[PDB]
Design a protein around this ligand. Structure first.
Ligand SMILES: CCCCCCCC(=O)SCCNC(=O)CCNC(=O)[C@H](O)C(C)(C)COP(=O)(O)OP(=O)(O)OC[C@H]1O[C@@H](n2cnc3c(N)ncnc32)[C@H](O)[C@@H]1OP(=O)(O)O
Ligand SMILES: CCCCCCCC(=O)SCCNC(=O)CCNC(=O)[C@H](O)C(C)(C)COP(=O)(O)OP(=O)(O)OC[C@H]1O[C@@H](n2cnc3c(N)ncnc32)[C@H](O)[C@@H]1OP(=O)(O)O
Ligand SMILES: CCCCCCCC(=O)SCCNC(=O)CCNC(=O)[C@H](O)C(C)(C)COP(=O)(O)OP(=O)(O)OC[C@H]1O[C@@H](n2cnc3c(N)ncnc32)[C@H](O)[C@@H]1OP(=O)(O)O
Ligand SMILES: CCCCCCCC(=O)SCCNC(=O)CCNC(=O)[C@H](O)C(C)(C)COP(=O)(O)OP(=O)(O)OC[C@H]1O[C@@H](n2cnc3c(N)ncnc32)[C@H](O)[C@@H]1OP(=O)(O)O
Ligand SMILES: CCCCCCCC(=O)SCCNC(=O)CCNC(=O)[C@H](O)C(C)(C)COP(=O)(O)OP(=O)(O)OC[C@H]1O[C@@H](n2cnc3c(N)ncnc32)[C@H](O)[C@@H]1OP(=O)(O)O
Ligand SMILES: CCCCCCCC(=O)SCCNC(=O)CCNC(=O)[C@H](O)C(C)(C)COP(=O)(O)OP(=O)(O)OC[C@H]1O[C@@H](n2cnc3c(N)ncnc32)[C@H](O)[C@@H]1OP(=O)(O)O
Lengths: 269, 271, 269, 271, 266, 266
C-alpha cells in the first residue's frame, strides 16, 4: 500500500514487480516528487518477499527526458519565501531527492531490469544505468547525460556507473562534450542484453514481450539463487556507489547556489 | 556575506574563523534550518583564504542537546498537507539537513577545533566527533548518542567516527545501551587534547582562554603547512565518512517513517 | 531446532540468545566439531527474529583453552587412510572448520556479547576478539594467542581483530613473542566494557549477573535500533575480515602440511 | 613429488608447467578430491623456481562439465553416519574444497594460461575465469554457470571475475537466467586472447599447437619480468577475490543445507 | 617555466597545448624531459583559464619512450658520482618516474592526447593516463616492451592497462611483448575518434583536432567538465597512487640487477 | 654493501642489527644515509637467516632527522647542475624519501627499533614504521616539526601517526608543532617496554635489549613470526603505499616554493 501516481503505475505479476512510467505526452519527465515516488516503489518491491525482479517500464517514444524543468522552475521564482537561503532551498529541492532515489536503486536487493522503450536523459538515464539488466526496443535508443550543457555535474552515481559500464575514456568524451551514449556504444559494451528490434511507436507491445519472455526465462530456475547471487554481485561497487552518491549530491549543490543550472534550465526548447 | 542566525554567530580574528552557538536558554538545541546554517558557515570558512582554523564554540552549561524536539514536532503534526507521504516528508526534513551538514564537516579543509563547554548529544555530538581537535572545559563533559533510545540509528558519520575515535567495543557498549562517552573514556582515548579544568558557569572565559592559547600556539608556524598536512590526513578515512554519510541518512529514513522516533521524541523531555 | 552438544548448551531468554560453554574439567577446549556447532548456533540465533543479543558464556576457571589437541591428534596417526594427502586432510580438518566458524562470527547480525569468566586461548580467544562487547569476571583474565609457539599463524581474523582492537604495535610484541594480552592491556584499550570483579571460582554466579544487568540495560531502548546500528557499524571492517579469513585459513594450511604444528601440539602439558 | 591422479596429469617442459585433464570419457568432471589435487598441482607449480607458466589443458570434446554429480550424490545419501549434521557435512565437503582450490588460483604467482578445448561449466568455468590468459580451440566454446538452475550461487570468485571480465550487465543477464557466456561475448570482451579455429575432435593437436606457439612467444623475453609484472597486476583485485572467496563459500553453505542443490543435481542429468 | 628544445607549449583560449617537437629522434625523451612535462602539467593545472591540456606530437611517432642514448649516459660515462648502484637508479629512474607519473595521475584539467603515431614505454604509459585519445590513422599502436627489456610495468600501467583494455587482453600483451594495436584500441573504446589522416602530416592532424575541440566546447559550462573529472578521478586515484609508488620501487631491483642495461645496449 | 662511516650493521644469529653510530652529530642523516638504510633493509630482507631487523643508535639521541647542513649543500653551493628547482628536489628529496620509506613499509622481517633518545622528522617517521619499539628511559619523544619547517607529513606519518596515536591526538601534535612525548607513547601502546636505563649509556641499553630478545625468541617457530607479519602487513600496506607516493609529491610544492630552505637556514 502506497499513494498513487498519475504519472507512474505499478503492478505485481508472479515474481515480477512492474514499475510503469505512464506519462508520454509530457515525455515521461519526472518532478522530484515522482523521483521520491520511484524510491518509494522500489522499497515496496524490495520489502515484498514474493518479488524477485523489479522491472522498470515506460511509455511513448522516450523512456524519460529526465528531470521536469517545469517542476524545477516552479521551485524558485514562484515562491521565494519559504527558504532562508538558496543553499537551504537546493538542499531540500535537489540534494535530498537525488540522494534518496539514487540510494533506493543502489541498495535494491532484487534484480532490476530496465526496458528502454526510447531514449533516457539526465537523472533518469542515471537510474537506467543503475539497473542490472537492460533490454532495448530498437536501435534508435540512447542515453544522454547533458551535465556540462546544464551547468551541473554527474548524478545518480554516474560518476561510478558510467565508466564502470561504458569505459573511463568513452565516458569522458561523452560527459565532457555533452555527447550521447548511442545504441552502438551500448551494444559494443554489452550494456543492452537484448534488442527486441521492435517499431519505435509500439512501446506497449514491446513492454509486454519482455515480460512474455521473462516468464519463460525464469521457468525452472531456483529464484532465491538469483537473489543470493545479486547479493554478492552487489558487493563489488556498493561502496564506490555509496561514496559517490553522497559526494555527487553535495558537490552539485554548489552549482545550484551559483545559479547557472537555473539560467540554463530556462531553455531549453 | 550570509543571512543572520539569531542562534549562531561568526567572526574572524586573523586566521581564526569562530562559530559561536549563542542560545543557552534552550541548551543550544539546533533546528533543521540551524544545522544547515552551520554548514553554510563552514563553507564560508572554507572559501575564505585567510582562514586556517574554524573554531566551533558554545554558550552556557551545554555544548548542544542536539536536534530540537520540539522543532521536530512542528515538522510533523502541525501541517500534514504539505508532503505527499511520510517518506517524502522525512527525505525533505531529515535526509536533506543531515546529509548536508555532515558533509560540510567531512570535507572541510581547515583545521577544525571544537570547544566542549558542556555535554553534546545526538547530531551535535556527531559534529563534535567530526572535528580535528577538541578541548574541554572541565571533567564533567560528555558525549551522548541516544539513538537506541530514540528509535534511531547512527548519524553524522558516527558509524565511522565513534569507533575510529573511541575504539569499537567501547562504541558498542555505548551506542547499543544508550550510555554516554563520559570524560574519562574521552581522555583515555586521547579524544580531548587538553582539558582546561574550568568551572561550568564561566564558559565565556573558557572560550576566551582557548582562543588566547591558540594565538600563542600558532606563532611562528607555517600555516599553509597545517592545511597541507590536514589534506593528507583527511584521505585516511575520507571515503569511509562519505560512504557512511549517504547510507546513514537513507537508512534512518526507514525509522522516521515507522514513526517510533516521533513517538519517542514526544515523551521523555516534558516534565 | 538443532543437535545437542554435551559440551555446549543454548537457551533463549527474552531478546537474548545464550550460548553456554559447559565443559569445565576439560577446560572448555573445543574440538573442530564443537567449533562448527558454535557456528551452527550463531546462525540459529541470527535467524531468530526475536533474538537481538547473542551472549556467549562459559564455565569454570577458563573461557576456553582453545582447540582440543586430543581432537587434533586423533585426526592424524589413529587413521591415516582416509585422505589422499596431508593437504587434503588439513583442508578438511583445519581449513574448512576455521573459515566456517570465523565467518559465522564475522557476519553475525545481532550484538555479540562475550562474558570472559577466565582466560581464553588460540581460536577461542580469536572468537572472543570477534564479539562486539566483552565483560570480564575479575582482573585475572587474559587472552593468549600462542601461534609462534605452536608453529602456526594468526587465525579467526586476528590478523584484523587483534591490532584493530589492541593496537598494531601491542599486537606485534604479543604475537611475535607468545606473550598474552593481559587484563591491564584490555582495560587500557577499552576492550573490556565492565569488570564485574567477582571471585575467580564463581563463573556461574557471574554469568547470571551479566544477564541480570542486561535485562535492565535494555529496558526502554528500541531494540531494532541496536540492530540497525550494528548493521552500519559492521561495514567498517567486514571486508578486511572477509579478506583476512580466506587468507589466514589458507596460509596456515602450509604450516600443517610441513608438519610442525603437530610436533608442537603433541605437548604440550 | 605428489600422489598420482588417474584423472589429472602434470609435466614440465622448460619453463612451462603443464596440467592436463585426461578423462574425456566422463567430460573431465572433477570430484571434490580432484579440485583439491588441482590446487596441490598449482602449489607445486608455484614452488618450482624454473616454472614461469602454468598451462591448464584438457581432453576430448569438453574442457570440464564441472563438479561430479554423481560424486556429489555419493557424498550424501550413501553414508549418513559420518557427519554430525547437514552443516558439518557441507563444510567438510563443499566449503573445504571450494575455498582451497579457488585460493590456489587466486594467489598463484605464475602466468596462468587456460586452453579451452570445449565448454566449461560451474566451478570449472570459474577456474577458467581465474586464469590470466585463455586461448580457445574453435568458436563453439562457451562458459556456463548454472547456479540459479542448481539452487546455488556464485563460486570460484566469479562474483569478482565474471563482471571483472565480461562486464556487469552481461554477467547478470547470464547468471540470473542460466544463460551461457558464449564465444562471441568472450571474443567481444577480449576474454579469449586467440582462437585457434581448430576442429573439435582434435583437442590433442590444439593442445600441442598452443604449446608450440608458447615456446616461440617466450623467445628472447626476460621471464622474471613476466613474473614481476604479474605480481603488480595481481594487486589490482587480489583483495576482492580474497573477500569474495571466503564469503562465496560460506554463503553457498546455507543452500546445501536447505537441500535444493541435491534435489536438483539429482534430476536433469539422467536420461 | 624554462625553455625545452624538444617540448614547446602554447595556450589557446582554455586549451593548454603541449607539442613534442623533436621528430627526427622519434620524440624519445630523457628523464629530464619527463620532469619537464610534469612541470608543464603543473602550469596547466594552476592556470585558472585552462580547462583542457592537449598533448600533441610530431612526425611519424608520438614518442618511442625513454631516450636509450641517455640511459647509457647515466652509466657508463660517469660512475663516480653515486655511492651505490641502488642510489644511482633511485635518482635517475625512481625519482623521475614517480614525479612525472604523479603529475598525470593528479592533473585536474581534461587531459586529451593526440596520438599522431605509435607510443612506446613510459610515453605510452602516459597516453593511457590521458582522459581522451584521438588518433591520426589506423596505423597507430601502443607498445609496452617491459618483458623484452628486463623491466616491469610503469606510469601506472599496472592499474591503467587492465583498466582500459581488460585484464586478460593486458596479460597477452604485457607477458609476451605484443603491442596493443589500433583494432584493440578501438575495441576497448580507448580511441574516441580516428581522424583517418595521412601519416605524412601530423601537423595537419593536430590543428584539425583543435578545430574540432573548439567546436565541441561551444556553449558548454566549462567548470562542469572540471567538476565532473574531480568526481570521475576518485574511482581510481587511490589505486593509481598505490600503483605509482610500488611500480617505481619494484623496478629498482631490475635496474640494480643489470638486465635493462644489458638489454638496452642492443 | 658498501661501508658507511655513520651506520654500521652486524648479524647475530637471526638478528640483523643496524647501529647508527655518529652521536656527536645527533645521528642526523643525509639523503644518501637514508638510501643506505633502505639498502641495508634490502640485505636484511633477502637474508633467509634473519628474522628480526634491529635498528639501534648512539649517545643522547636516536636521530634528529635530516642533516640540515646537507640540505644547504644541495642548494646554494652548486646550482648548475639542475635545469629547474622542481628537478632539484625531485632528485634530492622526492627520490630519497620514496625509496627509504618504501623500504621500511615493505620489509618482511620483524622490525624492532631501540629508541635510545629522541627521534625527529624523517628518522621519527621511520620509528613509527617499526613493528616494535623499546625505549631507554621516560625522557624520549618523537617530534614531527613539519608545521614549523614549512613542510608536510613524511615517511608515511600520514597513515602511521593517526594509526598509532589516534586521529585527534595526531592533529594537536602535527598542526601545532608539539612532540609526542613519552607519556602519550606509552598511553597509545607505541612503546612495548621501557628499560628505565640511564640516558648516559645508550650502549648498555642496546646490549640489554638484545639480551632480552634472544631470551624472548627461545623455542619459538621463527617462520611463524614471519608468516604472521605477512598477514599483519596487509591491514595497511595499501594505505601506506598511496601515502608514500602522494606524501613525496605534495611536499615538492613546498620545497620548490622556498619556505623549508628559508626555515632551515635558522
Ligand atoms: C530531484 C530533482 C532532480 C533535478 C536534477 C536536474 C539534473 C537532471 O536530472 S538532467 C535531466 C533534464 N532533462 C533535460 O535537460 C532534457 C531536456 N529536453 C530535451 O534536450 C528535449 O525534450 C529533447 C531534444 C531530448 C527531445 O525533444 P523533442 O524530440 O523535439 O520533443 P519535444 O517537442 O521537445 O517534447 C514533447 C513535449 O514534451 C515536453 N517535455 C519533454 N521533456 C520535458 C522535460 N524534461 N520537462 C518538461 N517537459 C518536457 C515538451 O515540453 C513538449 O511539450 P509541449 O510541446 O506540449 O510544450
Ligand atoms: C536535521 C534534523 C536532525 C534530526 C535528527 C534527530 C536525531 C538526533 O540528532 S538526537 C538529538 C536529540 N536530543 C535529545 O534527544 C536530547 C534530549 N534532551 C535531554 O535527554 C535533556 O535536555 C537532558 C537530560 C540532556 C538535559 O536536561 P536538563 O539538565 O534537566 O535541563 P532541561 O530543564 O531539560 O533544559 C532546559 C530547557 O532547555 C530545553 N531543551 C533542552 N534540550 C532541548 C532540545 N533538544 N529541544 C528543545 N528544547 C530543549 C528544555 O525544554 C528546557 O526548556 P523549558 O524548561 O523552558 O521548557
Ligand atoms: C578446527 C580446529 C582448529 C585448530 C586450530 C589450532 C590452533 C588454535 O586454535 S590454538 C588453541 C590451542 N590451545 C593451546 O595450545 C593451549 C594449551 N593449554 C595450555 O598452554 C594449558 O591448558 C594452560 C597452561 C593454559 C593451563 O593449564 P593449567 O592451569 O596447568 O591446567 P591443566 O592441568 O593443564 O588443565 C586441566 C585439564 O584440562 C585439560 N586441558 C586443558 N586444555 C586442553 C586442551 N586445549 N585440549 C585438551 N585438554 C585440555 C588438561 O589436559 C587437564 O586434563 P587432565 O589433567 O585430566 O589430563
Ligand atoms: C568441491 C565440490 C564442488 C561442488 C560445487 C557444485 C557447484 C558447481 O561447481 S556446478 C558444476 C556442475 N556441473 C553441471 O551441473 C553440468 C551438468 N552436465 C550437463 O548440463 C551435461 O553433461 C551437458 C548438457 C553440459 C553435456 O551433456 P551431453 O553433451 O549430452 O553429454 P552427456 O551424454 O550428458 O555426457 C557423457 C557422459 O559424461 C557424463 N558426465 C558429464 N558431466 C558429468 C558430471 N558433471 N558429473 C558426472 N558425470 C558427468 C555423463 O553422465 C555421461 O556418462 P554416461 O552416458 O556414461 O552415463
Ligand atoms: C626517467 C627515465 C625513464 C626510464 C624508464 C625506462 C623504461 C621505459 O620507459 S621503455 C621506453 C624505451 N623505448 C624503447 O625501448 C623503444 C626502442 N626503439 C625501438 O623498439 C625502435 O625506435 C622502433 C622499432 C620502435 C622504431 O624504429 P624505426 O621505425 O626502424 O626507426 P629508427 O631508424 O630506429 O629511428 C630513427 C632514429 O631515431 C632514433 N631513436 C628512436 N627511438 C629512440 C630512443 N628511444 N632513444 C634514442 N634514440 C631513438 C634512432 O636511434 C634513429 O636515429 P639514428 O638512425 O640517427 O641513429
Ligand atoms: C632525503 C632528504 C630528506 C629531507 C626531508 C626533510 C624533512 C625532515 O626529515 S625533518 C628532520 C630535520 N630535523 C630537524 O629539523 C631538527 C633540528 N634540530 C634541532 O630542533 C635540535 O638538534 C634539537 C633542539 C632537537 C636538539 O639540539 P640540542 O639538544 O641543543 O643539541 P645541539 O647543540 O643543537 O646539537 C649538537 C650538535 O649536533 C648538530 N646537529 C644536531 N642535529 C643536526 C641536524 N639535524 N643536522 C646537522 N647537524 C645537527 C648541531 O649542529 C651541533 O653541532 P655543533 O654544535 O658542533 O655545531
Amino acid at each position: 500500500e502506497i499513494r498513487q501516481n498519475e504519472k507512474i503505475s505499478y503492478r505485481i505479476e508472479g515474481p515480477f514487480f512492474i514499475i510503469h512510467l505512464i506519462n508520454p505526452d509530457n515525455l515521461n519527465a519526472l518532478e522530484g516528487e515522482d523521483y521520491i515516488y520511484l524510491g518509494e516503489l522500489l522499497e515496496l518491491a524490495d520489502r515484498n518477499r514474493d518479488v524477485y525482479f523489479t522491472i522498470i517500464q515506460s511509455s511513448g517514444r522516450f523512456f524519460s527526458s529526465g528531470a521536469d524543468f517545469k517542476g524545477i522552475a516552479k521551485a524558485q521564482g514562484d515562491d521565494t519565501n519559504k527558504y532562508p537561503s538558496e543553499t537551504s532551498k537546493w538542499v531540500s529541492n535537489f540534494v535530498a531527492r537525488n540522494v534518496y532515489v539514487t540510494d533506493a536503486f543502489i541498495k535494491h536487493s532484487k534484480v532490476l531490469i530496465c526496458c528502454l522503450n526510447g531514449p533516457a536523459i539526465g537523472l533518469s538515464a542515471a537510474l537506467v544505468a543503475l539497473c542490472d539488466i537492460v533490454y532495448s526496443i530498437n536501435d534508435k535508443v540512447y542515453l544522454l547525460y547533458p551535465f556540462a550543457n546544464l551547468g551541473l555535474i554527474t548524478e545518480g552515481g554516474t560518476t561510478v556507473s558510467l565508466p564502470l559500464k561504458f569505459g573511463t575514456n568513452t565516458t569522458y568524451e561523452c560527459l565532457m562534450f555533452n555527447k550521447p551514449f548511442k545504441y552502438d556504444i551500448m551494444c559494443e559494451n554489452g550494456f543492452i542484453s537484448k534488442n527486441f528490434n521492435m517499431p519505435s511507436s509500439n512501446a506497449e507491445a514491446f513492454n509486454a514481450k519482455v515480460l512474455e519472455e521473462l516468464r519463460e526465462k525464469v521457468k525452472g530456475l531456483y529464484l532465491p539463487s538469483c537473489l543470493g547471487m545479486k547479493k554478492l554481485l552487489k558487493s563489488n561497487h556498493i561502496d564506490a556507489f555509496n561514496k559517490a552518491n553522497s559526494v555527487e549530491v553535495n558537490e552539485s549543490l554548489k552549482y545550484w547556489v551559483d545559479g547557472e543550472p537555473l539560467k540554463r534550465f530556462r531553455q531549453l526548447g
